[PDB]
Amino acid sequence: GGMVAMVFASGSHVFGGIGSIFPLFMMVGIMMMMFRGMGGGQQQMSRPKL
Amino acid sequence: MKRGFARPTPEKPPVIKPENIVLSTPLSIPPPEGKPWWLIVVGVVVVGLL
């Protein structure tokens, strides 16, 4: 968000309209990795083994 | 009329040697370990999208 805001304050305004799809897709991808993701050795019951 | 023939002590026969052999136990299949392939696939996309 800091990168986008810095670019917005500088005045590029490149992210207006459909240009906004890049930050949007990235922010969703990061969310998938940090909340669900996959476990280490402490969670032995991983779907493929169960 | 026949020729005479005297039977001596029988000559030594070749000795038989028995054997006890226990078979080697077969190998065990390596159990199915599984990699989170999809995680790295999202990873290369996110770093690329940046």
From Swiss-Prot, chain A:
<feature type="transmembrane region" description="Helical">
    <location>
        <begin position="15"/>
        <end position="35"/>
    </location>
</feature>
<comment type="subunit">
    <text>Part of the ESX-5 / type VII secretion system (T7SS), which is composed of cytosolic and membrane components. The ESX-5 membrane complex is composed of EccB5, EccC5, EccD5 and EccE5.</text>
</comment>
<comment type="function">
    <text>Part of the ESX-5 specialized secretion system, which is responsible for the secretion of EsxN and a number of PE_PGRS and PPE proteins, including PPE41.</text>
</comment>
<protein>
    <recommendedName>
        <fullName>ESX-5 secretion system protein EccC5</fullName>
    </recommendedName>
</protein>
